[PDB]
Design a protein around this ligand. Structure first.
Ligand SMILES: CC(=O)SCCNC(=O)CCNC(=O)[C@H](O)C(C)(C)COP(=O)(O)OP(=O)(O)OC[C@H]1O[C@@H](n2cnc3c(N)ncnc32)[C@H](O)[C@@H]1OP(=O)(O)O
Length: 174
């Protein structure tokens, strides 16, 4: 239903959306061991430390169900040294619980963050997504993202490919 900035009380819910969607989306792509390892508590604490840090440049958003549960979230911030001059912002994470997907929540989250990054003066934003994640890829391609590059990372013990999509913030109306 609605999108808003996250508060500290929203984090336990943010952590569940994160872990549950990671588990549902990366089955057979990211090692089972690693996926089983994710922690609701660990995740909630990590975001909590960030939210509590006054100088943290990250921006957090959550998507609410009709009754108010946190069923989606998105984090935006400065790029994390991706090596693409001209791309100063990055979509750190965006996840919507499987059953709440394809109802416009991801788009709404995306637009809210891009709007804020635009107001903060970032010219362009990129996003990294697993080469083997059709869901996220299809979503970004549909939204206009242009393929920028790729890199191999290692999650769990697995070496995996990741691709980047670029989006224009300046000038565009989000
Ligand atoms: C940010 C990094 O972590 S990359 C990882 C991204 N997260 C994941 O892959 C986790 C699994 N997936 C999800 O959480 C969600 O599906 C997301 C975040 C990828 C997308 O959010 P959703 O709410 O499902 O998409 P939403 O309903 O807002 O779709 C918006 C538009 O994109 C289109 N779209 C969304 N996904 C796809 C897709 N996979 N293929 C083609 N089109 C798509 C929708 O049809 C819609 O089109 P429309 O505006 O013309 O009607």
């Amino acid at each position: 239903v609605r999108i808003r900035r996250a508060g500290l009380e929203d984090l336990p819910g943010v952590a569940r959306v994160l872990v549950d969607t990671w588990r549902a989306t990366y089955r057979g792509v990211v090692p089972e061991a690693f996926l089983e390892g994710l922690s609701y508590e660990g995740q909630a604490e990590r975001w909590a430390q960030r939210l509590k840090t006054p100088t943290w440049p990250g921006r957090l958003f959550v998507a609410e169900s009709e009754s108010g549960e946190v069923v989606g979230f998105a984090a935006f911030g400065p790029d994390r040294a991706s090596g693409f001059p001209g791309y100063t912002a990055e979509l750190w994470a965006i996840y919507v619980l499987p059953t709440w997907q394809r109802k416009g929540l991801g788009r709404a989250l995306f637009h809210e963050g891009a709007r804020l990054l635009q107001a903060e003066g970032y010219g362009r934003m990129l996003v990294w997504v697993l080469k083997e994640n059709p869901k996220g890829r299809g979503f970004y391609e549909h939204l206009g993202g242009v393929l920028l590059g790729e890199r191999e990372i290692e999650l769990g013990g697995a070496k995996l490919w990741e691709v980047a999509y670029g989006f224009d913030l300046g000038g565009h109306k989000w």
